[PDB]
Design a binder for this molecule. Structure first.
Ligand code: CUA
Ligand code: CUA
Ligand SMILES: [Ca+2]
Ligand SMILES: [Ca+2]
Ligand SMILES: [Cl-]
Ligand SMILES: [Cl-]
Ligand code: NA
Ligand code: NA
Lengths: 588, 584
């Protein structure tokens, strides 16, 4: 299997890395593991102006005031159990958000703050018949309402919720109150069932309390029952949110119609659907096991045909110390990270099932040492029925001496492994920044991108509407619109020249600069920086971008194109003239 | 023969550090060479969610008032030198967008000082004094502005409209002096004695439009007599501008008479790169609109400033014709120069002494090879090229239009930073490295030239101001877990030790201004902790033996979780605490 990509050769797969604590999404080529692009999401990006421009701040909404995010889990939208290449979704644990990235323009186009919860951690997409819903876990138990009258996690109104977001509209679809808490989650291959692990069935806040119970559980959701209750109006709402809320808790030992609790040891973490649709596999973390939940026994479970929720467990292989995450090669093998043993263990799911029934069989096929302390891992196409068993990435937290020292902070070691054969083969150590934690791979032919924007693209439609109110045709006009203490500069740009090369304002004016890049050739990006005003953005071909700032400094202030666009780029500049406040009417 | 190994396999280590400019994204990046893998990101002018640079009190203190900016625009990373060799102490880099120079300490790989250059706009080129050591950082301000810039005068042709050459004291990171020049400044370099520096000018016309800037057949390389400048400062013969105490010297021509501080050497045309050869013989200016480089003999500059030469052009000793669009030059230490040809889209290898002899009229071919690169190269960098130890092993050419060299990724494209083996007679392209936001230029150092710390010193100046605040509250940071109440201000101090915060709950009043100071008292390498307050925009990292702090207001009543962001321990997921906010 081709391991190295030489000059002029192209990678075979796209890789989509979580930006971890840094808050972006990163696009890699696989197997070279080179970073092809960064997609700003929850971070503020100086280069493209994401978080500064009006288009990006509009998408982020009120949360545009936050400069941070914390990502764990990127996933790609699916139709009939295969990637369709339309959207990537990712979480923000720091400020409780879900973001959607449009894979044709490789930009975040929608973002939502999940109401009435704290810390969006695990995130996973419905597989069948398509990604109708984004499932997202809120990790932490909070009071409802959280008005500062009650702080007790044990109070009857303290809880966290499982969240369903409508993938196309990016509005809340529903929420399900659960017992315990939520960690990771996955979905079946029918659309009926989803499942999530829980490490805090104790509803404790201290380390000892969260580890008391021998077993926590994975909670299973009957999505069809949830929908039928919504359509029937059998739900409540919390605070000012209109989101339908359904109660998935047990009440005095009696289950709700929406959930079932399958006991699993112990503080389990990963929750992974095998690519043949057979199992929800939970990683036991503090228990040296995984637990295999038979998805085809779920209907019986929810219909009372089983006495014990443990009856849906058909395997619980002992694997090693600190199992965290599981992936699949599509050949009947699972691969599980062992955080303490610092290994990836390859095991056969059907053989593990037969061992659970008493049959003495050795389901463990190989243990590969990794470097060191692996968290999550990802096999190519593992989340689809097309899992091709070619590549595996294990994302290890302590890289130690695997890379040159770079001071007190260390990179994550994202290790590429060849699994095309019977023997796992470590081939590349990929160091990464701010603990990406997890990633997703897609074949080259599963991703179709645009090189030139469409002029009607929703990403900047609000700006077109604004321009229209000013009587502006963005494809041609170079005009300075004045409106009291607001100035709205509209210009085209075509390398190497800004369409407006100087304009004059009063000190204190609120200036919006809107630039439409009318170059028609691929890869002619322009930039726009106002010196010493903290203003910076990128404009790609046929895109419109805008940014607003206050001209609070009298005098002449240069602006320049930051992105090399032409042999005469260094000369693509302009001048803002700011008339001193003492030469104009003075206010207080 | 050029035949170095390019593969760094699992378990093997890179041979060089590479320090990449973060370009328009504003950070510094540390790569391993020859793998070309990014080992670390060092936040500088960007706001970093992961470590809290731009949010923490220690980082905002370093940034000063400019902490209000969330952007930077970087081009020119350079490493401090002693006796013309890298000494591993500091990395310096420019911010063109908000007119700054930042210093990075290479032992901790963090920005530790930052300065806004007074009375200028757009710090672009930057370069370090080489000998006897990096006393000064030299920084170009690119754009001509009025003085004062108070909005009475906007005419760039006015007698008080000009830009300035900036010298920053490298060790104190305070301004040392500024030199007013004619025209504008592009790139700059320094000699191997400490007496001379030089910079290219493209806007000798002092025009604001594209046509007017390309008006003159020749611009120039302005040469600076730094000894003369220092002598005038020492004698008090200078002025100051506005509210800056920086000594300002007038380096402009006056009615055709030269300053004592400058000489203007005519060079074609809108020249860009300005590169000192590793043998110390030449300032080499890249011709850009002229298909040439011009070679200024550093040995002739003393006679030039002494008035012993009949024409400023006499210090020009070579002007090789190389190709279309020469922008930048580097050196292998074997006598060759390597120059980017933006238009021809090549790296041309040429022999400097043979060019000098050609300029005198000898029939000799100084061009050795042209290597196609992909595509439109800007700057280039050979290993140790800025030192008298230039080792002629690796060359990076940083090309702007990657076209079809990588998988498509939407309307934006990566820069193509191509690794080239120059160890033998023939340049060999060996690796295409895609990079984000046009790093533009980079600098390499041998592994043994960089020595980093794995554990912070408790006395480190980086968080000394926080140690001081802690003193005023009576806090021993190594041990204490205490909540100090002071009006509507709450100062939480805690140790942390994987997997537990030293303070796991505290209660405040809605509207309080909360400062959380965390001291990581783990003593094992690479056990970093994080601290994130959910839904409050608060995030930071704390490495072993570091103290880090962050301030935010508790504007939301109720229970609000905080958690450790960096995987520190098998029980990392359970390392959490609770902030309880009592309603007003
Ligand atoms: Cu337009 Cu550079
Ligand atoms: Cu401490 Cu994660
Ligand atoms: Ca538990
Ligand atoms: Ca010129
Ligand atoms: Cl998972
Ligand atoms: Cl240069
Ligand atoms: Na939204
Ligand atoms: Na400073």
């Amino acid at each position: 299997q081709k391991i190295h990509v030489g000059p002029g050769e192209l990678d075979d797969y796209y890789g989509f890395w979580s930006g971890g604590h840094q808050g972006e999404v990163r696009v890699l080529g696989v197997p070279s593991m080179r970073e092809l692009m960064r997609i700003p999401v929850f971070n503020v990006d100086s280069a493209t102006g994401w978080g500064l421009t009006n288009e990006s701040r509009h998408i982020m909404g009120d949360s545009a005031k936050f400069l941070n995010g914390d990502c764990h889990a990127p996933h790609i939208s699916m139709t009939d159990g295969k990637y369709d290449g339309k959207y990537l979704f990712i979480n923000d644990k720091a400020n409780s958000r879900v973001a959607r990235i449009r894979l044709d323009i490789m930009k975040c186009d929608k973002m939502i703050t999940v109401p009435n919860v704290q810390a969006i951690h695990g995130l996973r997409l419905q597989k069948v018949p398509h990604t109708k819903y984004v499932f997202a876990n809120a990790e932490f138990i909070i009071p409802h309402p959280n008005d500062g009258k009650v702080f007790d996690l044990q109070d009857e109104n303290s809880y966290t919720m499982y969240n369903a977001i409508d993938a196309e509209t990016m509005e809340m679809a529903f929420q399900v109150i659960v017992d315990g808490n939520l960690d990771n989650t996955d979905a079946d291959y029918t659309g009926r069932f989803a499942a999530a692990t829980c490490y805090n069935s104790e509803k404790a806040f201290d380390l000892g309390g969260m580890m008391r119970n021998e077993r926590d559980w994975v909670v299973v959701f009957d999505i069809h029952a949830v929908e039928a209750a919504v359509k029937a109006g059998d739900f409540i709402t919390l605070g000012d949110s209109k989101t339908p809320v359904l109660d998935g808790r047990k009440k005095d030992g009696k289950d709700s119609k929406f959930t079932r609790y399958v006991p699993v040891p112990k503080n389990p973490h990963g929750c992974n659907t095998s690519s043949d649709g057979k199992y929800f596999i939970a990683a036991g973390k503090l228990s040296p096991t995984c637990s295999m939940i038979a998805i085809d026994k779920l209907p019986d479970l929810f219909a009372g045909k089983l006495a014990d929720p443990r009856d849906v467990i058909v395997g619980e292989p002992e694997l090693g110390l600190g199992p965290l995450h599981t992936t699949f090669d599509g050949r009947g093998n699972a691969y599980t990270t062992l955080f303490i043993d610092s290994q990836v263990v390859k095991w056969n799911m059907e053989e593990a099932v037969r061992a659970y029934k008493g049959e003495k069989v050795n389901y463990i096929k190989q243990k590969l040492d990794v470097h060191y302390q692996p968290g999550h891992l990802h096999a190519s196409l593992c989340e689809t029925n097309e899992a091709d068993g070619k590549w595996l990435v294990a994302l290890s937290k302590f890289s130690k001496d695997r890379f040159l020292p770079v001071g007190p902070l260390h990179p994550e070691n994202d290790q590429l492994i060849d699994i095309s054969g019977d023997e796992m083969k470590l081939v590349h150590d990929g160091p990464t920044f701010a603990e990406p934690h997890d990633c997703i791979m897609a074949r080259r032919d599963q991703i179709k991108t645009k090189k030139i924007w469409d002029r009607n693209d929703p990403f900047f439609a609000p700006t077109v509407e604004m321009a229209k109110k000013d009587g502006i045709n963005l494809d041609t006009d170079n005009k300075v619109i004045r409106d009291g203490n607001k100035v709205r500069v509209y210009m085209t740009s075509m390398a190497p020249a800004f369409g407006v090369q100087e304009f004059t304002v009063k000190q204190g004016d609120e200036v919006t600069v809107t630039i439409t890049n009318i170059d028609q050739i691929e890869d002619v990006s322009h930039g726009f920086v106002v010196v010493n005003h903290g203003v910076s953005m990128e404009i790609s071909p046929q895109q419109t971008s805008s940014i607003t700032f206050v001209a609070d400094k009298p005098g002449l202030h240069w602006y320049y194109c930051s992105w090399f666009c032409h042999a005469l780029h260094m000369e693509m500049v302009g001048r803002m003239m700011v008339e001193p406040a003492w030469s104009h009417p003075q206010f207080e």
